[PDB]
Design a binder for these strands. Structure first.
Ligand SMILES: [Mg+2]
Ligand SMILES: [Mg+2]
Ligand SMILES: [Mg+2]
Ligand SMILES: [Mg+2]
Ligand SMILES: [Mg+2]
Ligand SMILES: [Mg+2]
Ligand SMILES: [Mg+2]
Ligand SMILES: [Mg+2]
Ligand SMILES: [Mg+2]
Ligand SMILES: [Mg+2]
Ligand SMILES: [Mg+2]
Ligand SMILES: [Mg+2]
Ligand SMILES: [Mg+2]
Ligand SMILES: [Mg+2]
Ligand SMILES: [Mg+2]
Ligand SMILES: [Mg+2]
Ligand SMILES: [Mg+2]
Ligand SMILES: [Mg+2]
Ligand SMILES: [Mg+2]
Ligand SMILES: [Mg+2]
Ligand SMILES: [Mg+2]
Ligand SMILES: [Mg+2]
Ligand SMILES: [Mg+2]
Ligand SMILES: [Mg+2]
Ligand SMILES: [Mg+2]
Ligand SMILES: [Mg+2]
Ligand SMILES: [Mg+2]
Ligand SMILES: [Mg+2]
Ligand SMILES: [Mg+2]
Ligand SMILES: [Mg+2]
Ligand SMILES: [Mg+2]
Ligand SMILES: [Mg+2]
Ligand SMILES: [Mg+2]
Ligand SMILES: [Mg+2]
Ligand SMILES: [Mg+2]
Ligand SMILES: [Mg+2]
Ligand SMILES: [Mg+2]
Ligand SMILES: [Mg+2]
Ligand SMILES: [Mg+2]
Ligand SMILES: [Mg+2]
Lengths: 101, 116, 87, 70
RNA sequence: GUGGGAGAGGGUGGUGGAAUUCCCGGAGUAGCGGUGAAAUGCGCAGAUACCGGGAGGAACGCCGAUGGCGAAGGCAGCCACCUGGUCCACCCGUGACGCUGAGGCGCGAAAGCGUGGGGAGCAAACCGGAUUAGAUACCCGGGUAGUCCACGCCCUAAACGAUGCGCGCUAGGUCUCUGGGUCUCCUGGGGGCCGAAGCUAACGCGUUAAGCGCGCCGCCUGGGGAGUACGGCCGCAAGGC
């Protein structure tokens, strides 16, 4: 198992009934693919640099997990299925390379 | 018959012609002119004089609809691309701002033999 | 790929003695494992030709060490080939 | 002119999510500054280019912008 | 072996924005386009220019470099999986296990061929417009095969560093990529520029040798005829050795 970082941006117009559903759906998808969650950072409403899906903002999520490597691309396929889910980018974790130290 | 009094003005300047369109803040055009709308016919349209007269013809057409404030957009390089702007500032229309939005691709399509 | 967990498993199995890391038997074992990792990677991905080159270099090196073992001590050569299922 | 690394602190060059600092490395347009203007090293600029492209796909850094002059 | 390291190295899938074309709507009149000038072309069935939305294919701007990777061909969005090569620190292990390499086998830009897809842009042939003494061309408008993908052939090149490979030896200075180090620097492995000795017909090369040596393979012996004829092998063909 390697360690990855998940970036999810969904439609920033959801109420709490839809936001809890979309997010607990992301929880259920991680359980089926064996993603041990290490920490979570939720930014939320953030000003986008260009329109995405005709919408000028986006609700941001970030998960750091440890999972088997072979199932990553099938996990990316499972997240983009949801309509509200718009951006899915999974990056292998890396060390914080410093500059001007 | 519109009474807009404010809007955008696009300048599409090529090496073969310079053409000006005047619109409203949403993008929909009001009037327009070019090097061919005025008497010039051939290569004379890609000249700075034609670029000046075309800019001023559209400006007087926008006065009919009551235009005072004007935001300027410019696309393309060519003779008279600057002479049209300089004509537009002294056209009575108080020029609000000037933006260059010339579309540059990310090397997506293969150009004609001319451009290679 | 090939983690150091699986690596130590092979070295300790084919070592002539504790601490031995570079015996000819140990080199051929390690070479053979990467052969089977690539030959299975080349069953699929049949159009990967740059990886195909590295496999020829490993086969040439594996046969280079076996041809050496054949000359010096032919017994350990047979005990090695029978243990890896080659030739 | 000053350079970006000269007027800055100790920052993470691999953090694609820190837009406040990565906006410093973009020009007036969405373009990426050359090394002459960022004051970075060879290896640093290569990492910055990749982490900027990541932020671009996350809607955080603009692909291209509009120049207000001329 | 151990521990680290950089990378358009490769293969597979996924994915992002810009732009071109086309469709839909909104708005909007008289031309746009193109050239040294023009004309064919397109436009009142409403184009060009502008806003919004959609479809599709192909190529990845800036970063980008005189840079990096690869045995060569060659490899540029991003993400992930699979994966090759290579380099450095430790001085740990085996104990000459090495070098080259006629055949063989595998790879091999583009173009072309077969089968089936795909088809936005570009574009042989070809259809036109000009130029011209003429235009079987450069310039202009259209446009098919093809360029893209899958599978199978084809084996050529300015396939270039016009420099086969490996090793040892022979002043340095300077720019650089990437490691390690007691980090004005030293020490490696590549990528450039000047230049000692020396070589070379000269231009020029010069620790990345074209220098001094050694091992092995390939090849050369006047031009035209001619990379043609015959024969053979290979190929569906074009044709290749
Ligand atoms: Mg979706
Ligand atoms: Mg003209
Ligand atoms: Mg790669
Ligand atoms: Mg690749
Ligand atoms: Mg329409
Ligand atoms: Mg007509
Ligand atoms: Mg008509
Ligand atoms: Mg008609
Ligand atoms: Mg179509
Ligand atoms: Mg460039
Ligand atoms: Mg080349
Ligand atoms: Mg690797
Ligand atoms: Mg020793
Ligand atoms: Mg020893
Ligand atoms: Mg001993
Ligand atoms: Mg060899
Ligand atoms: Mg051979
Ligand atoms: Mg070929
Ligand atoms: Mg081809
Ligand atoms: Mg074909
Ligand atoms: Mg064309
Ligand atoms: Mg043509
Ligand atoms: Mg003549
Ligand atoms: Mg004629
Ligand atoms: Mg010669
Ligand atoms: Mg020689
Ligand atoms: Mg250092
Ligand atoms: Mg190299
Ligand atoms: Mg060097
Ligand atoms: Mg001399
Ligand atoms: Mg000579
Ligand atoms: Mg020199
Ligand atoms: Mg030498
Ligand atoms: Mg010959
Ligand atoms: Mg003769
Ligand atoms: Mg020939
Ligand atoms: Mg004969
Ligand atoms: Mg023959
Ligand atoms: Mg035959
Ligand atoms: Mg021929």
């Amino acid at each position: 198992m390697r360690r990855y970082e998940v970036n999810i941006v969904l439609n920033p117009n959801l109420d709490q009934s839809q936001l809890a559903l979309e997010k607990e759906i992301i929880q259920r998808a991680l359980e089926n693919y064996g993603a041990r969650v290490e920490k979570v950072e939720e930014l939320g409403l953030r000003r986008l640099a260009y329109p995405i899906a005709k919408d000028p903002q986006g609700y941001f999520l970030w998960y750091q997990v440890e999972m088997p490597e072979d199932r990553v691309n099938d996990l990316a396929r499972e997240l983009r299925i949801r309509d509200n889910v718009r951006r899915v980018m999974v990056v292998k974790s890396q060390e914080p390379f410093l500059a001007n130290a | 018959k519109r009474q807009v009094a404010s809007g955008r003005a696009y300048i599409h300047a090529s090496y073969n012609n310079t053409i000006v369109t005047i619109t409203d803040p949403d993008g929909n055009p009001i009037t327009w002119s070019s090097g061919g709308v005025i008497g010039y016919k051939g290569s004379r349209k890609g000249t700075p004089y034609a670029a000046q007269l075309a800019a001023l013809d559209a400006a007087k057409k926008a006065m009919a609809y009551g235009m005072q404030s004007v935001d300027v957009i410019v696309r393309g390089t060519g003779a008279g691309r600057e002479q049209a702007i300089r004509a537009l500032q002294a056209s009575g229309l108080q020029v609000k701002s000037i933006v260059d939005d010339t579309p540059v691709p990310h090397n997506g399509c293969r150009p004609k033999k001319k451009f290679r | 790929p090939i983690t150091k967990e699986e690596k130590q498993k092979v070295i300790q199995e084919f070592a002539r003695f504790p601490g031995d890391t570079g015996s000819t038997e140990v080199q051929v074992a390690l070479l053979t494992l990467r052969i089977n990792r690539l030959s299975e990677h080349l069953k699929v991905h049949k159009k990967d030709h740059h990886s195909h080159r590295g496999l020829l270099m490993m086969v040439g090196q594996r046969r280079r060490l076996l041809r050496y073992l054949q000359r010096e001590d032919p017994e350990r050569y047979r005990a090695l080939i029978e243990k890896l299922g080659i030739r | 002119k000053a350079k970006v690394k000269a007027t800055l602190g100790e920052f993470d060059l691999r953090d694609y999510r820190n837009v406040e600092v990565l906006k410093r490395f973009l020009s007036e347009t969405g373009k990426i500054l050359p090394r002459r203007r960022t004051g970075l090293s060879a290896k640093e600029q290569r990492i910055l280019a990749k982490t900027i492209k990541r932020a671009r796909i996350l809607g955080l850094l603009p692909f291209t912008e509009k120049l207000v002059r001329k």
